[PDB]
Design a protein around this ligand. Structure first.
Ligand SMILES: *[C@@H]1O[C@H](CO)[C@@H](O[C@@H]2O[C@H](CO)[C@@H](O[C@@H]3O[C@H](CO)[C@@H](O)[C@H](O)[C@@H]3O)[C@H](O)[C@H]2NC(C)=O)[C@H](O)[C@H]1NC(C)=O
Lengths: 116, 98
């Protein structure tokens, strides 16, 4: 009785973490965030905390898709800048990366909970 | 349309010995808000807002690699943002590391 409410509660938390992790992996083609695995990343921060995840993804994108670093192992992650119209297009106004990431993460968390 | 094309140069040159330094200098008109240094791909870039107005009509931004490796080799180009529009990109510059 008491320990099935326990296994039930962690089964639900696992399915939520799994939903957001799959969504971030499939959309950003990333397996790690902020120096740790996405499963390890979601032990400390909430599964629907759009602001924290978007800021961490922004910081990682600026750090791993730069002109200085040389060879970028993960091109697909940087390629997301083209999806979010973040790459410079002559004649048009600036699109901030953090804001586009925030909108994307918003859709992804809504989609994961929509699974729920 | 009214924005002039930026130019890209490398100092001390396009051929850098392995381990040595190189600096890409992006030049545009006065009032550049942001310079963006792009690689062969649009999504691989570095931005800077420390733009120094050298002359009443020419401003520049510098992107410096202290120690190049083989992965730094390849194409680079400049683009700048001014008056709510990105300018057209400069021509590509090939960095050769030996
Ligand atoms: C993202 O990576 C950073 C590290 O680069 C992690 O930041 C650190 O997170 C811990 C909480 O897990 C913060 O709390 C504690 O701070 C006290 C001082 O108040 C210190 O005594 C503890 O040892 C621990 O550091 C810490 O301040 C924080 N530091 C920074 C620079 O952010 C962060 O947790 C990572 N985020 C995720 C979701 O993994």
């Amino acid at each position: 009785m008491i320990e099935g409410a326990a296994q039930g509660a962690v089964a639900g938390e696992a399915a939520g973490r799994n939903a957001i992790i799959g969504a971030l992996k499939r959309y950003f083609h990333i397996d790690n965030l902020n120096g740790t695995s996405l499963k390890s990343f979601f032990n400390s921060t909430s599964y629907s905390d759009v602001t924290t995840i978007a800021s961490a993804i922004d910081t990682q994108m600026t750090a791993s898709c730069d002109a200085f670093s040389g060879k970028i192992v993960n091109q697909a992650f940087c390629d997301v800048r083209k999806t979010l119209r973040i790459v410079a297009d002559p004649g048009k106004s600036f699109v901030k990366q953090k804001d586009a990431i925030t909108g994307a993460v918003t859709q992804l968390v809504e989609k994961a909970k929509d699974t729920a | 349309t009214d924005l002039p094309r930026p130019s890209i140069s490398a100092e001390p040159g396009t051929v850098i010995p392995l381990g040595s330094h190189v600096t890409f200098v992006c030049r545009g008109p006065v009032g550049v808000q942001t310079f963006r240094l792009e690689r062969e791909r649009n999504y691989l870039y570095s931005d800077t807002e420390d733009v120094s107005q050298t002359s009443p009509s020419e401003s520049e931004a510098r992107f410096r690699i202290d120690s190049v490796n083989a992965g730094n080799a390849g194409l680079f180009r400049c683009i700048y943002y001014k008056s709510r529009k990105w300018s057209e990109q400069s021509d590509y510059l090939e960095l050769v590391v030996k």
